[PDB]
């Protein structure tokens, strides 16, 4: 019925303050649509290390995506996508932070670059994992295929590679005519 969704958004040194801003606006437009609804949200920034910008019980208190994300700062470091997903599996999906044990686990990962680390995300095996690779780094099939090990199977449906950050607007409208 109800779902717990975590936004795992990139904050590396390859993002431009405008491109970082577009991701932030994207996450909001999504929340805004999925409001008056049995969803609750959390947002984690990742780079070299990882930070919960707001958790679930922050969301259910505040509700406003604008007010929830106003303290966000651009990390401007690396892209440790492996350590990031593990961090979301063990640190964020806890009832300590307001997560519901009956709610299904969803993870929206947003990145503009390949992982700067290694390992596995076996800790996040019961989490539904979407991954969004954004332009000019995933401008080759080989690099786009690196995101498949992060997503849920099949990649055909759980991986989206966008050409430009301006195309995050396009993606949002897609989801509006979707069920």
């Amino acid at each position, epitope marked *: 019925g109800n779902v717990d969704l975590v936004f795992l958004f990139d904050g590396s040194m390859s993002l431009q303050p405008d491109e970082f801003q577009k991701i932030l606006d994207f996450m909001k437009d999504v929340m805004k649509k999925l409001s008056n609804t049995s969803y609750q949200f959390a947002a984690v920034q990742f780079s070299t290390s990882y930070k919960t910008e707001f958790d679930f019980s922050d969301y259910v208190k505040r509700k406003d995506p*604008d007010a929830l994300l106003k303290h966000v700062k651009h990390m401007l470091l690396l892209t440790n996508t492996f350590g990031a997903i593990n961090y979301v599996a063990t640190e964020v999906f806890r009832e300590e932070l307001g997560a519901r044990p009956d709610a299904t686990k969803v993870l929206i990962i947003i990145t503009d670059g390949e992982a700067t680390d290694s390992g596995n995300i076996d800790a996040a095996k019961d989490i539904i994992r979407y991954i969004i690779g954004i332009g000019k780094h995933f401008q080759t099939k080989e690099s786009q295929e690196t995101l498949h090990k992060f997503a849920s199977k099949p990649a055909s449906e759980f991986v989206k590679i966008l050409d430009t950050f301006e195309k995050l607007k396009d993606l949002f409208t897609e989801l509006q005519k979707k069920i």
Partner: antibody
Amino acid sequence: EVQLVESGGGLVQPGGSLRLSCAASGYSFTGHWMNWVRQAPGKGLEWVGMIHPSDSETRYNQKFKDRFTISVDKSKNTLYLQMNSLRAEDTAVYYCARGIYFYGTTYFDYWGQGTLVTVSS
Amino acid sequence: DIQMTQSPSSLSASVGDRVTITCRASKTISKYLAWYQQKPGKAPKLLIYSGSTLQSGVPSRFSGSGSGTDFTLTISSLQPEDFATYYCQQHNEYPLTFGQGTKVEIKR
């Protein structure tokens, strides 16, 4: 385009009040911190304080916190600065400037055109 | 608070010269310094932030440098359009403090 148009400046007597306005356009007004900066004639820039329109959270320069009050109206996409118990040194050009919060504390990328406030009897 | 000290207070240089404006900090502010260009009657305009990052739209003839207390704006190859007081600002802690400005005038 990002537009910041200010109004409300003019002549005001010592001990008098005045509310400035900053009309914001061309971007999501509730997505950026807003700032007030002032400049006395032929002098430098002074930070007054900031406000986040979403929930109207504020941070002031303590130099200004007593007599200056920053508020917002999300419905009008408008930022206010309420000045009280004014005096001669408050004569300045008052700018509203959109801030970036990403790096360090805050810097300003978009500024208003400014408005002169003259405190005189 | 952090006192931002600019050097010099005013200057004059001919078109095509290297202008070096220095901003110094009361105490360490990492790399988080910003430069503004203010033209007559107009509002200040962002040139540099985080010590050395050029804003989008600003000509690459503008360059920021420095970390800690000593910072430098270098306008290389000065232009007639480049007449306009320059202010520096610290964005490392609150309150936000500006320099005092340096008038850059043009020898012809």
